[PDB]
C-alpha cells in the first residue's frame, strides 16, 4: 500500500480567539505558526478549517510491509527539514554533520531552494513493526531538529502511528478518524520579524487558548485505543492532570493518573462515563492556563455485602512540629533563623484536622497517643454497603468531604433539590451538623472467576483543595481482606498557613505590635509555608518488623509538592514491579503492593535525601531492630586541572572523580583503554557477579581529606558497647577497607535479564563534592558467564552514560584557579565531562545482541528523554516484547537489549534547550569486520614530507617497507634501540589488522620479534591499544622466519588518522618493515560473489565484444588475479565505443573500480588519458564537470601494477562504464567486481 501523503510548513497571523511590539491587554495580538497540508496536488484548493483543529497533530498511520513517501514545500524564509525517531534512514535529513571539511555529501540539509520535494521513502518491516504478543498498535512522533532557535519559537511537533494491518478483516470502526493529544509552548521573541521585555512564557495545548479548545467527549463504555504524547524543551513546568478515568491495561489493574510534564506513553483510555471530563491546573491565577472546555456529545457505538460498619470522627489536635531543640550548635549557619526577628512566630499552630476517634465524649480536649495522630482514619467497606460517618467542624468556617473513585451518588429522597443549589459541590456543613454520604462500589471490584487477593485504592476530599490543603484532610483506605494493625505510614503534608484562616488570629495572638512586619511583606508569606514529613522530625518516627508474617508493606503519598522528591530506605531493596531497586523517586498519586524483608539491622545516620529538604534537622530514622579468591578492587580520587577549551566554549577547572587502581601504593594505576572508555570524567566500571567481596582500601592522595560512601554498606551490629555512628571522612594516608558481601536475592530470574545495574554516591556532600565530580557507578551480574580470569565473552558490549549539572560555585576551587603562582561565566552545563562534540569511544559490534544500562541522577534539570538516534530498543517482560519507550528517571535504572542492523554515525538527541545550546554531541561509530585492504601507504598514496622522524642518512629510505618488497635496502639501520615512524591516514577511517614481514641483509633474516602499537588523533592526547583483556600489558609476538605472513584481527578497532609504532624489541638491527591494513566505515570494497565461475554468463552484458569463430575471450573471463592463457579482454576493434556494462538492478553510488594489465608476452602497457561516462536512459550525458576540463586521474603505471579508479564525487545514474583511450601494443584489459548491495 503506497501512501501518497504530503506536508507543508507556513507561518500565520492568528490569536486563536475569533470564532512597536508591546503588550496590549484583552486577548492581545500575536503571530502564531502552524503547519498546513494539501491532500490534493492543486496547492490552492483547501477544505475549510474547523474551529477545533488548531495545532492538532497531523497523524500518519502506516502498515507493515508498506512503503510511505513524505514531501515538504518551503513557504518560510529559512531552510528546515524533518527529523525521524526510531526509523532507519540514510542521513538525508539528520542535520548534524561532523569533522570532514569535504564537499556536499549531505550538506543539502540547510539548503532548500524555492520548491523541492526531498522525499524520504521510509520502510516498515517485521523488525520495524509490532509482533503478535506486542500491543495492537504502537506510536511514534517527529519533530524538526535542524533549526534550534526557530523550533524553540515554533514547537511544531508531529505524531506517527505504525503497526500491522487489520482494516481488511472484520474490525471495529473506531480506529483512525484522526484523534491525538499534544502540547506546545509559545514564544516568538527571537523570531524572524522579532520586535523592557515584560513578556512571560506560557504554553498552549492543541493550538487553542481561552476556551477555544473542544474535544472532551463522552460515549458508550467502549474500549477506545487513544494514546497521549507530550514533551517539554523549555525550563519550568506546569501542573496538568486528568479526571475522567485511570489508565487500565490487560488484566492487571493500574489506577495510575500519570499526567506528567513530559510523557511518551503508549496506552488506552476507557470511556465509561457519558458527559464532560475536566483537566485542572494547580495555578491560582485563572488568566494563566485557561483551557476550560465544555462537553461535546456523540455516540461511539450503539462480592456480597457484609457488616463492616465503623465510626469516623473529626477533631483538632495541636502538635509541636519540632520537639527537639538544637539551637546552641551553630556549626553550619543553621541558627540564623533561630533568632527572633521580623518573621519569627514559633511552633504552636492551631487548625482543625481530620482523624478517627472512637468515643463521643466531647467535653474538653484530651491528649491522644503518640505516633497515632496527624494520620487519617482507616476505612474498610464492601460493595453496596451502608456506613455512617459523623462529621463536625470546630470552627464556624465550613469544611466538607467528597469521596474519590466513587461515582454512584444519588440525591436523598428527591431527585432534584428545590433549593438554589442543584449539585453536591457546595453543600453547607454546619459546625456540628450530622450528614452522611451514600456510596456504592461498582461491579468491576471482582472479576470473573478471579476474586483478587488484595488491591490498592485510596481516597480523600476533592471539593475545596484551595482550602482543604490548609487543613490537612487525608484519609487512608485499606480495601481488601486478611490477605493492618501497625499503622505509621509516612506522609508528606506541607503546612500552607497563609491560606489557613487561623493565621489572622495568630497575628494578634503572637505579635502585640505588628507595626514591624506590616503583614504586606511577601517574604513572610514565602517563609510561613514550612515543609513537614508526616508531622514528626528530629528522631521521632520509628518502625520495626520481622520475618514470617502474613502481611504486606504499604506506603502512600498525596500532593504534587510543586517538584520531585527522592526518598527511600538504604539497606532494604523493595520490590516495585518485580524489579529490585533501591532509590525510588516520590511522584504524587501512586500506590502499589509491596513487602520488605527484615534480614540485617544497622544504624547509619541518614536523612530524607531530598535536594532542598533534610536541612531542618530531620532524620526519619528507620531502626528496624528486632521484634575461590576474590578480585581486588580499589577506588581512588585525583584532581585534573583541565579547562574544557577556549575556542568555541587563566580559568582552569580541576575535577575529582572516582577511579579504579591496583594496589595501596600510588605507583601503577593499571591504565587501560578501548573497552574501558567508560571512565571518561565519570566513575569506574566494576564487573562483579557473586561471592567476591570488595576490599577497597580507599585512601586519597589529592590535597584535602574527603569521604567515600558505598551506598550498599552491609554490616552487622558492629561497634558494640554503644551504637556510635560512622565518622567516615577518609583522610589521606590511612587504611580503611569498605567491604560487604553481595546478596543472592538481588539477582533476577534466569528468564529475565541476568545482570542488574545500580549506582553509588558520597552521602556527605551531594552538592558540594559529588557535584564537584565524585560520582561513581557500579555493576552487578549473576551466574557465571564471564568465564576465565579476564572474560573473553564477545556476547554483549556494555557501556553506560550519565547526566548532571556542573557549576563553578559547587566546586571548592574558585579563588585558586590562577595556578597560585556580561556574567555569562556563571552558567555551565555538564555533559558527561567533555563538550564540543569530541567524546568518542562508544564502539560496539554491528550485528549481535548488546545490553545497555541507562543511568542518570542529580538535580531536576538532568532527567529527560534520551535515546540513540535511529534505533529500536526494548525490554523482555518474561515474554518476547517490543516497545521503544524508556527514558531517564532518577534512580530507576534497568537494562535494555538492542541490535542495530545498519552502520554509520549517529547522534545523541538533546530535548532540553540549556544543554543543546552547550554544543553537546557524544556520538558513536560502528564498523564492519569484513574489510581487508591497505589504506594508503603499502600502495604509496601518501606523500613524502608528511612523514617525519629524527635524523636522516644518505642512501637509506624507510618508505620501502611496503609488502613483498626486499633486496638491499628494506629497513633503516640506527644504533639507538627503539624508533618511531609516523604515517598519517589523511582521514579517520577504521583500522582492523596489522601485518609484517621479515627482511634480509648480508646473511641474516631480519625481522621484529615483538612490538606494541600506539596511536593518537592530534599528537597531544597519546593512548595505546590496551584491549582484548587477558592482562593489562600484552606483548605482540612477531615473525618466526623470513617468509612468515600471518593474519590477526583486533577485537576493539583502532580509531585514529595518525599512528606511531615503537619497536622496543628488535632483531640485531633496527628493522623497519610496516604494512598498514585498513578500511572505511562503509565497507563497500569487496567482490559481490562473482569469484564463482559458476555464476551465469548472461548476467553481464555489453555493447559488443571479441566476437569471431574463436569467440572465447569473454569480458567476464578477464578476472583480476587469475592464471590462464591469454586471459584478457579485447573489444571487437580498436574503438572507444565499447563499454563494460554490468548487472545493476539497483541504483548505487560509485566508490572505486580497479583495472589490471595482462601478464602475457612480457610487455609494459600504460594509459595516459581516458574518460568515464554516466547515463540513465541511454540519451543524456552528464558527468562531474568541474573548473573547465573534466577531472581526470592517471593510473596504470606498468603492465602489472593495478590501479583503482576511486571516484569520490557522486557519479549518479544507473549506468557506469569505462572506455580506454590510450593503449600500448594491443588492447588487453582485466577487471574485477567491486562494491556492495545496500541503500
Amino acid at each position, epitope marked *: 500500500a503506497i501512501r501518497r501523503y504530503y506536508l507543508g510548513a507556513v507561518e500565520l497571523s492568528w490569536d486563536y480567539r475569533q470564532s512597536g511590539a508591546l503588550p496590549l491587554g484583552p486577548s492581545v495580538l500575536y503571530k502564531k505558526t502552524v503547519f498546513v497540508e494539501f491532500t490534493d496536488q492543486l496547492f490552492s484548493v483547501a477544505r475549510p478549517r474547523p474551529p477545533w483543529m488548531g495545532l492538532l497533530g497531523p497523524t500518519i498511520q502506516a502498515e507493515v510491509y508498506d512503503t510511505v513517501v513524505v514531501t515538504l514545500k518551503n513557504m518560510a524564509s529559512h531552510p528546515v527539514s524533518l527529523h525521524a525517531v526510531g526509523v532507519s534512514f540514510w542521513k538525508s535529513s539528520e542535520g548534524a554533520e561532523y569533522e570532514d571539511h569535504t564537499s556536499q555529501r549531505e550538506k543539502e540539509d540547510d539548503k532548500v531552494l524555492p520548491g523541492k520535494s526531498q522525499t524520504y521513502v521510509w520502510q516498515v518491516l517485521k523488525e520495524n513493526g509490532p509482533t503478535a504478543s506486542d500491543p495492537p498498535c504502537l506510536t511514534y512522533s517527529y519533530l524538526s531538529h535542524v533549526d534550534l532557535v526557530k523550533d524553540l519559537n515554533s514547537g511544531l511537533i508531529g505524531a506517527l502511528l505504525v503497526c500491522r494491518e487489520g482494516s481488511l478483516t472484520r474490525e471495529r470502526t473506531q480506529n483512525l478518524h484522526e484523534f491525538v493529544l499534544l502540547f506546545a509552548v509559545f514564544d516568538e521573541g527571537k523570531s524572524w520579524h522579532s520586535a523592557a521585555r515584560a513578556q512571560p512564557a506560557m504554553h498552549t495545548v492543541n493550538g487553542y487558548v481561552n476556551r477555544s479548545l473542544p474535544g472532551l467527549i463522552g460515549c458508550h463504555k467502549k474500549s477506545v485505543y487513544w494514546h497521549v504524547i507530550g514533551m517539554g524543551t523549555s525550563p519550568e513546568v506546569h501542573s496538568i492532570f486528568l479526571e475522567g478515568h485511570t489508565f487500565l491495561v490487560r488484566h492487571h489493574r493500574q489506577a495510575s493518573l500519570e499526567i506528567s510534564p513530559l510523557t511518551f506513553l503508549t496506552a488506552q483510555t476507557f470511556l465509561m462515563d457519558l458527559g464532560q471530563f475536566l483537566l485542572f491546573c494547580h495555578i491560582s491565577s485563572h488568566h494563566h492556563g485557561g483551557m476550560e472546555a465544555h462537553v461535546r456529545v456523540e455516540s461511539c457505538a450503539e462480592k456480597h455485602p457484609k457488616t463492616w460498619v465503623h465510626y469516623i470522627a473529626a477533631e483538632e489536635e495541636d502538635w509541636d512540629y519540632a520537639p527537639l531543640v538544637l539551637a546552641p550548635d551553630d556549626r553550619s549557619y543553621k541558627s540564623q533563623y533561630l533568632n527572633n526577628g521580623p518573621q519569627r512566630i514559633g511552633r504552636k499552630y492551631k487548625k482543625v484536622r481530620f482523624m478517627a476517634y472512637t468515643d463521643e465524649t466531647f467535653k474538653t480536649r484530651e491528649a491522644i497517643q503518640h505516633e497515632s495522630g496527624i494520620l487519617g482514619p482507616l476505612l474498610y467497606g464492601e460493595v453496596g454497603d451502608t456506613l455512617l460517618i459523623i462529621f463536625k467542624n470546630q470552627a464556624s468556617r465550613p469544611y466538607n468531604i467528597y469521596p474519590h473513585g466513587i461515582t454512584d451518588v444519588r440525591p436523598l429522597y428527591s431527585r432534584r433539590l428545590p433549593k438554589g443549589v442543584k449539585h453536591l459541590k457546595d453543600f453547607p456543613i454546619l459546625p456540628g451538623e450530622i450528614f452522611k454520604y451514600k456510596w456504592t462500589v461498582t461491579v468491576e471490584d471482582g472479576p470473573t472467576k478471579s476474586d483478587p487477593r488484595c488491591l490498592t485504592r485510596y481516597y480523600s476530599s476533592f471539593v475545596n483543595m484551595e482550602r482543604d490543603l490548609a487543613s490537612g484532610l487525608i484519609g487512608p483506605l485499606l480495601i481488601c481482606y486478611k490477605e493492618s494493625d501497625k499503622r505509621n505510614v509516612i506522609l508528606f503534608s506541607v503546612f500552607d498557613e497563609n491560606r489557613s484562616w487561623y493565621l489572622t488570629e495568630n497575628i494578634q495572638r503572637f505579635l502585640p505590635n505588628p507595626a514591624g512586619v506590616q503583614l504586606e511583606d511577601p517574604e513572610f508569606q514565602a517563609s510561613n509555608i514550612m515543609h513537614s514529613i508526616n508531622g514528626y522530625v528530629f528522631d521521632s518516627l520509628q518502625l520495626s518488623v520481622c520475618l514470617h508474617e502474613v502481611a504486606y508493606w504499604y506506603i502512600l503519598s498525596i500532593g504534587a509538592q510543586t517538584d520531585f522528591l527522592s526518598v527511600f530506605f538504604s539497606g532494604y531493596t523493595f520490590k516495585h514491579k518485580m524489579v529490585y531497586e533501591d532509590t525510588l523517586t516520590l511522584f504524587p498519586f501512586s500506590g502499589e503492593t509491596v513487602f520488605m524483608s527484615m534480614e540485617n539491622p544497622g544504624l547509619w545516620i541518614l536523612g530524607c535525601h531530598n535536594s532542598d529538604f533534610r536541612n531542618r534537622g530531620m532524620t526519619a530514622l528507620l531502626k528496624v531492630s528486632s521484634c575461590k579468591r576474590t578480585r581486588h578492587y580499589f577506588i581512588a580520587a585525583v584532581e585534573q586541572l583541565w579547562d574544557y577549551g577556549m575556542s568555541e566554549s587563566v580559568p582552569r577547572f580541576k575535577k575529582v572523580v572516582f577511579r579504579e587502581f591496583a594496589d595501596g601504593s600510588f605507583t601503577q594505576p593499571s591504565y587501560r583503554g578501548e573497552l574501558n572508555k567508560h571512565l571518561g570524567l565519570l566513575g569506574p566500571y566494576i564487573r562483579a557477579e557473586v561471592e567476591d567481596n570488595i576490599m577497597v582500601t580507599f585512601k586519597n592522595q589529592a590535597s584535602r581529606p574527603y569521604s567515600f560512601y558505598s551506598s550498599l554498606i552491609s554490616y552487622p551490629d558492629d561497634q558494640e558497647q554503644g551504637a556510635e555512628p560512622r565518622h567516615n571522612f577518609v583522610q589521606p594516608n590511612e587504611t580503611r577497607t569498605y567491604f560487604w558481601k553481595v546478596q543472592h536475592h538481588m539477582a533476577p530470574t534466569e528468564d529475565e535479564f541476568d545482570c542488574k545495574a545500580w549506582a553509588y554516591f558520597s552521602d556527605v556532600d551531594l552538592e558540594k563534592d559529588v557535584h564537584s565530580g565524585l560520582i561513581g557507578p557500579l555493576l552487578i551480574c549473576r551466574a557465571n558467564t564471564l568465564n576465565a580470569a579476564h572474560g573473553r565473552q564477545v556476547t554483549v558490549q556494555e557501556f553506560a552514560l550519565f547526566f548532571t549539572i556542573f557549576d563553578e560555585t559547587k566546586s571548592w576551587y574558585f579563588t585558586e584557579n590562577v595556578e597560585r603562582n556580561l556574567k555569562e561565566n556563571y552558567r555551565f552545563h555538564a555533559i558527561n565531562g567533555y563538550v564540543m562534540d569530541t567524546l568518542p569511544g562508544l564502539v560496539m559490534a554491528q550485528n549481535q545482541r548488546i545490553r545497555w544500562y541507562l543511568l542518570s541522577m542529580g538535580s531536576n534539570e538532568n532527567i529527560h528523554s534520551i535515546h540513540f538516534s535511529g534505533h529500536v530498543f526494548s525490554v523482555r517482560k518474561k515474554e518476547e516484547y517490543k516497545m521503544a519507550v524508556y527514558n531517564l528517571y532518577p534512580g530507576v535504572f534497568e537494562t535494555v537489549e538492542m541490535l542495530p542492523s545498519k552502520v554509520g554515525i549517529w547522534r545523541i538527541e538533546c530535548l532540553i534547550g540549556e544543554h543543546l545550546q552547550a554544543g553537546m554531541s557524544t556520538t558513536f561509530l560502528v564498523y564492519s569486520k569484513k574489510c581487508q585492504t591497505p589504506l594508503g601507504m603499502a600502495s604509496g598514496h601518501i606523500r613524502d614530507f608528511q612523514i617525519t622522524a629524527s635524523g636522516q642518512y644518505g642512501q637509506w629510505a624507510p618508505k620501502l617497507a611496503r609488502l613483498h618488497y626486499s633486496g638491499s635496502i628494506n629497513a633503516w639501520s640506527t*644504533k639507538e634501540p627503539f624508533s618511531w615512524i609516523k604515517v598519517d591516514l589523511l582521514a579517520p577511517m577504521i583500522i582492523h589488522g596489522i601485518k609484517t614481514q621479515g627482511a634480509r641483509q*648480508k*646473511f*641474516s*633474516s631480519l625481522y621484529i620479534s615483538q612490538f606494541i602499537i600506539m596511536y593518537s588523533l592530534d599528537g597531544k592526547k597519546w593512548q595505546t591499544y590496551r584491549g582484548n583483556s587477558t592482562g593489562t600489558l600484552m606483548v605482540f609476538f612477531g615473525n618466526v622466519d623470513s617468509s612468515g605472513i600471518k593474519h590477526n584481527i583486533f577485537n576493539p578497532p583502532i580509531i585514529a588518522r595518525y599512528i606511531r609504532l615503537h619497536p622496543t624489541h628488535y632483531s*640485531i638491527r633496527s628493522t623497519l618493515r610496516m604494512e598498514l591494513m585498513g578500511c572505511d566505515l562503509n565497507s563497500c570494497s569487496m567482490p559481490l560473489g562473482m569469484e564463482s565461475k559458476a555464476i551465469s554468463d548472461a548476467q553481464i552484458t555489453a555493447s559488443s565484444y571479441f566476437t569471431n569463430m574463436f569467440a572465447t575471450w569473454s569480458p567476464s573471463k578477464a578476472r583480476l588475479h587469475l592464471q590462464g592463457r591469454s586471459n584478457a579482454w579485447r573489444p571487437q576493434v580498436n574503438n572507444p565505443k565499447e563499454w563494460l556494462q554490468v548487472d545493476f538492478q539497483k541504483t548505487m553510488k560509485v566508490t572505486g573500480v580497479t583495472t589490471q594489465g595482462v601478464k602475457s608476452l612480457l610487455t609494459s602497457m600504460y594509459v595516459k588519458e581516458f574518460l568515464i561516462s554516466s547515463s540513465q536512459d541511454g540519451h543524456q550525458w552528464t558527468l562531474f564537470f568541474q573548473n573547465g576540463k573534466v577531472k581526470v586521474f592517471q593510473g596504470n603505471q606498468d603492465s602489472f601494477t593495478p590501479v583503482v579508479n576511486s571516484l569520490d564525487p557522486p557519479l549518479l545514474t544507473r549506468y557506469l562504464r569505462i572506455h580506454p583511450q590510450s593503449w600500448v601494443h594491443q588492447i588487453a584489459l582485466r577487471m574485477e567486481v567491486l562494491g556492495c548491495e545496500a541503500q
Partner: antibody, heavy 120, light 108 residues
Framework: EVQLVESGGGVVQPGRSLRLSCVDS????????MHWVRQAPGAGLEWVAV????????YYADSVKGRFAISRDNAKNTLYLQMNSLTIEDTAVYYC?????????????WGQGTLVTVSS | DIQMTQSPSSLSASVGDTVTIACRAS??????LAWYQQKPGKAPKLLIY???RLQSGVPSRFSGSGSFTDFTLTINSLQPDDSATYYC?????????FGGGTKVDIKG
C-alpha cells in the same frame, strides 16, 4: 654466544681417508653459514687465494671444486679436505669460524689449531 | 669486478709519526670492508667495526674511515709492533680480489 668445538682428526697418512667436521652447541645459524679458510702469512688465504666465497658456492674464478660434497644441510657447516692428494696443501693453523650476525660480544670467534707437518 | 692490491709490504721509520694505509678499488663499493690484525703468531682478529663506526672499547690507535672507493686508516700511537698483516676485503658476492699482505721486516 655459541661455542665451536672440533670433532675429528688431523694426522694425514697416504693409504686411507678420514672425515672432518666442525660442530657448534646451539643451532643459531642460517642457510648461508658455510665458508672455509686457513693461514698463509704474507700471502693469500689458502696459499695465494681464498678457498671459497659466494656465500654457499665452491667457486671463485676457475677450477670449480664441486668434489667438495656437502653432507647434511641447514644448521651445520662441513666439507671434506681431500688428504690423499693435497697433503701439504692442507697444512696450516686451522680455524673454525663464521662471521656472526648479532655482533654484541665478539663478531668472529676463531679456532686454535696446532703445528702440522707431512709424514716423512 | 673488484680487483684490489695492498701497498706497501714493509716499512721502518722514526718515532712520533702518523701515516695511513689504503687500497685501490675497482668501482663503487660500500664502506664495510674487513681489517684483521695478525701479529706474527696470533689469530687475525678485527678491531674496527664495519670500518665506519669504531667499536667501543677499542684503543684510539686504530681509527678507520673512508667510503665509496677510498678508505683511510689513521694511526694515533706509534709502536714497533708494525709487524701486522692487513687485508682489504669487501663483503659482496661479485668477483672480488683482496690485498696481498703487509709483513714488515725488522732492521738490525
Amino acid at each position: 654466544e655459541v661455542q665451536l668445538v672440533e670433532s675429528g682428526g688431523g694426522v694425514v697418512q697416504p693409504g686411507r681417508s678420514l672425515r672432518l667436521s666442525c660442530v657448534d652447541s646451539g643451532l643459531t645459524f642460517s642457510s648461508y653459514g658455510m665458508h672455509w679458510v686457513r693461514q698463509a702469512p704474507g700471502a693469500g688465504l689458502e696459499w695465494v687465494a681464498v678457498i671459497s666465497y659466494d656465500g654457499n658456492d665452491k667457486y671463485y674464478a676457475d677450477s670449480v671444486k664441486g668434489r667438495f660434497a656437502i653432507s647434511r644441510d641447514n644448521a651445520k657447516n662441513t666439507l671434506y679436505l681431500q688428504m690423499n692428494s693435497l697433503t701439504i696443501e692442507d697444512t696450516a693453523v686451522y680455524y673454525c669460524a663464521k662471521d656472526l650476525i648479532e655482533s654484541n660480544i665478539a663478531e668472529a670467534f676463531w679456532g686454535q689449531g696446532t703445528l702440522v707437518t707431512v709424514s716423512s | 669486478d673488484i680487483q684490489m692490491t695492498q701497498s706497501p709490504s714493509s716499512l721502518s721509520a722514526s718515532v712520533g709519526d702518523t701515516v695511513t694505509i689504503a687500497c685501490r678499488a675497482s668501482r663503487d663499493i660500500r664502506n664495510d670492508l674487513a681489517w684483521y690484525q695478525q701479529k706474527p703468531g696470533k689469530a687475525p682478529k678485527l678491531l674496527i667495526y664495519a670500518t665506519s663506526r669504531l667499536q667501543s672499547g677499542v684503543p684510539s690507535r686504530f681509527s678507520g674511515s673512508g667510503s665509496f672507493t677510498d678508505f683511510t686508516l689513521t694511526i694515533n700511537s706509534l709502536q714497533p709492533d708494525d709487524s701486522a698483516t692487513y687485508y682489504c676485503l669487501q663483503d659482496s658476492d661479485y668477483p672480488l680480489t683482496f690485498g696481498g699482505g703487509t709483513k714488515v721486516d725488522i732492521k738490525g
